[PDB]
Paper text:
To neutralize chemokines, ticks secrete small cysteine-rich chemokine-binding proteins in their saliva with no homologues in mammals, termed Evasins. In contrast to the highly selective Evasin-1, its homologue Evasin-4 binds ∼20 CC-chemokines with nanomolar affinity. Among this broad range of chemokines, the chemokine CC-motif ligand 5 (CCL5, also known as RANTES) is of particular interest, because it is one of the most expressed chemokines by activated platelets and plays a prominent role in the development of atherosclerosis. Thus, Evasin-4 binds to the CCL5 monomer and causes disruption of the CCL5 dimer by shifting the monomer/dimer equilibrium toward the monomeric form of the chemokine and not by direct replacing of CCL5 from the dimer.
In the present study, the structure of Evasin-4 was determined by X-ray crystallography. The Evasin-4 structure consists of eight β-strands and one short α-helix and has an L-shaped topology with the N- and C-terminal subdomains oriented orthogonally. Superposition of all six polypeptide chains of the three Evasin-4 crystal forms showed that the rigid Evasin-4 protein core is flanked by two more flexible protrusions. The first protrusion is formed by the N-terminal region (Glu16–Leu25) plus the loop β3–β4 (Ser48–Thr51) that extend from the N-terminal β-sheet. The second protrusion extends from the C-terminal β-sheet and consist of the loop β5–β6 (Asp68–Tyr82), including the α-helix (Ala74–Gln77). Residues Glu1–Glu15 are unresolved in all three crystal forms as a result of high flexibility. The crystal packing reveals a large intermolecular interface of 2,380 Å2 buried surface area common to all three Evasin-4 crystal forms. This interface involves the N-terminal region of Evasin-4 that forms an extended intermolecular antiparallel β-sheet, predominantly involving strand β1 next to strands β3 and β4 of each molecule. However, size-exclusion chromatography (SEC) and multiangle light scattering (MALS) analysis in solution show that Evasin-4 is a monomer, indicating that the packing in the crystal may not be physiologically relevant. In addition, the six independent structures of Evasin-4, arising from three different crystal forms we report here, are very similar to each other, suggesting that the crystal packing does not have major consequences on the overall structure of Evasin-4.
Residue numbers in the entry:
A (entry chain A): 18 to 72, 79 to 104
B (entry chain B): 18 to 104
The structure:
């Protein structure tokens, strides 16, 4: 505009412990033009495992922290959806 | 529904060196209806100081202006500086 900020939208998994990055600590984002991936900061919350059912609904999932671009334990117990 | 990811949209100042956080390394974000501030991660690009295009000088859309870029260090924008154009 004359007063516009630039928006960046990034995509996470919902959980009882907040928005989670993936196990590879690399989030998909989009600017008003393009799609790209950004590495999560160290210690951001990230998904370690999803306790899927063989068969919709929330699942139990375990939650870690990013450590140098990969999700590390020890795990915390959450529900994800 | 449960196939959707959760989007988080945060708002930055654009520049020749990419999207910038402010000098306090804290940005405005939106999740669904909630508006809130999040701390920028260490090493994110940020404005070192109070740079802006003075309202009087405006005569163009997205009129660009000189600005200085540092990196976030423990919630404050730190040098060394880089020279950028912001808009």
């Amino acid at each position: 505009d004359y007063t516009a900020y630039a928006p960046l939208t990034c995509y996470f998994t919902n959980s009882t412990l907040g928005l989670l990055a993936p196990p590879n600590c690399s989030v998909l984002c989009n600017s008003t033009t393009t799609w790209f991936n950004e590495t999560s900061p160290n210690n951001a919350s990230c998904l370690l495992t999803v306790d899927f059912l063989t068969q919709n609904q929330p699942y139990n999932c375990s939650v870690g922290h990013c450590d140098n671009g990969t999700c590390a334990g020890p795990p915390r117990h959450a529900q994800c959806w």
